[PDB]
C-alpha cells in the first residue's frame, strides 16, 4: 500500500535542472514525517501548508520534481523568484501549494576534475511559465546580428554543464532538489494519511 518515495529521494542519478524529472504519485499512503524531521535534508520550506497537517490530509495527486542545481540557486526554487533557474529551467507558480526539499550532494554528484552530466539553461527567448520544461538544442540570438547557425559572437549555445568538483565552495556545490506539489481538482481523493 505504502508510497514509493525512496525511489524519488534515495535515487542513483538525478535530473539536470532544465531537464527536470517528475513522477506523479497516486493511490498510496504517504508518511511524510520521515521527510520533514528526517533532517538528513538541508532545506525544507512549505508554502500553502503546515508541515504537520499534511500527514493526515488528502489529495487527487502528489507530483515530485527531482533535479540538481548549485546551492546558491536553491533560493530560486520558491514562488515570486528571479534569475537563471526560476526564469529558464524550472519556475514555481506564485500561489504554489507544496514543499521544497533540498540536500547537499557534493559527496555524490561531484567528481575529480568535474561531473559534466548535470546541466542548466543559460539564456532563453522569454521566461518559463509555471512548471514549463525546455530541452531546446537551438542557438540563442543575443544580438540583432543573425546567427548563420554558427556559435560565435552574440550567438550562444543555450545549455551549460555545471562541472561540479569536490574542491568547490559550498554555494557552487551541487544540491539535490525535490518539489512536492499538491492538488485536488475535482475527481477523487487518492493520497493521505494515516
Amino acid at each position, epitope marked *: 500500500n505504502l508510497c514509493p518515495f525512496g525511489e524519488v529521494f534515495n535515487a542513483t*542519478r538525478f*535530473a*539536470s535542472v*532544465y*531537464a527536470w*524529472n*517528475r*513522477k506523479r504519485i497516486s493511490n498510496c499512503v504517504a508518511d511524510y514525517s520521515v521527510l520533514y524531521n528526517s533532517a538528513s535534508f538541508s532545506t525544507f520550506k512549505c508554502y500553502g501548508v503546515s508541515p504537520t497537517k499534511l500527514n493526515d490530509l488528502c489529495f487527487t495527486n502528489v507530483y515530485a520534481d527531482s533535479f540538481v542545481i548549485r546551492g546558491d540557486e536553491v533560493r530560486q526554487i520558491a514562488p515570486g523568484q528571479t534569475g537563471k533557474i526560476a526564469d529558464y529551467n524550472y519556475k514555481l507558480p506564485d500561489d504554489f501549494t507544496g514543499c521544497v526539499i533540498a540536500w547537499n550532494s557534493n559527496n555524490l554528484d561531484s567528481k575529480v576534475g*568535474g561531473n*559534466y*552530466n548535470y*546541466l542548466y539553461r543559460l539564456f532563453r527567448k522569454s521566461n518559463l511559465k509555471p512548471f514549463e520544461r525546455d*530541452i531546446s*538544442t537551438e*542557438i540563442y540570438q543575443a544580438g540583432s546580428t543573425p*546567427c548563420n*547557425g*554558427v*556559435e*560565435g*559572437f552574440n*550567438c550562444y*549555445f543555450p*545549455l551549460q*554543464s555545471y*562541472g561540479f568538483q569536490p574542491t568547490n565552495g559550498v554555494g557552487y556545490q551541487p544540491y539535490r532538489v525535490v518539489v512536492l506539489s499538491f492538488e485536488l481538482l475535482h475527481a477523487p481523493a487518492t493520497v493521505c494519511g494515516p
Partner: nanobody, 121 residues
Framework: EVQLVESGGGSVQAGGSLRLSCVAS????????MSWYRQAPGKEREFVSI???????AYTDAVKGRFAISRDNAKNTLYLQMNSLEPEDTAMYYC???????????????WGQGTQVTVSS
C-alpha cells in the same frame, strides 16, 4: 541507459585530416540530438558542433568550413570529419548525447571517454 564511446584519434601532421567515430549502445525511448565538444587542455570543455534529430547542423565559428558532422543510424555511429587541421585543434574531443523526451521517460544525456587529437610544426 547508453554507453557512448569515441574512436579514431591521435597525432598527425598539420594540414592533414581525421575522422572521429562515436559508437553508441543500448539505447532509449528517443533519438537524442548529438554533439561534439573538445578540451583545449587548459581552456574549459567547449562546444564544437551539433546535429539534431531534425538533421540541422550548427558549428562553432572556430571550425566553420573545415569540420563536418554526420550520422549513419544504420551503424548507430556519429562522424566528425576534420579537414585542414591546425595545432589549435589539439584537444581531447568528446561526443555528447543531449536531452530528449517521450511522455515521461526523460533521457538526460551522456558523455563519452574522449579521444586525444594532436597536431604540430
Amino acid at each position: 541507459e547508453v554507453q557512448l564511446v569515441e574512436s579514431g584519434g591521435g597525432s598527425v601532421q598539420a594540414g592533414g585530416s581525421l575522422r572521429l567515430s562515436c559508437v553508441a549502445s543500448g539505447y532509449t525511448y528517443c533519438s537524442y540530438d548529438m554533439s561534439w565538444y573538445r578540451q583545449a587542455p587548459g581552456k574549459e570543455r567547449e562546444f564544437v558542433s551539433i546535429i539534431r534529430r531534425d538533421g540541422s547542423t550548427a558549428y562553432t565559428d572556430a571550425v566553420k568550413g573545415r569540420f563536418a558532422i554526420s550520422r549513419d543510424n544504420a551503424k548507430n555511429t556519429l562522424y566528425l570529419q576534420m579537414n585542414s587541421l591546425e595545432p589549435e585543434d589539439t584537444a581531447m574531443y568528446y561526443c555528447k548525447s543531449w536531452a530528449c523526451s517521450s511522455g515521461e521517460y526523460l533521457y538526460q544525456g551522456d558523455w563519452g571517454q574522449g579521444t586525444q587529437v594532436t597536431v604540430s610544426s
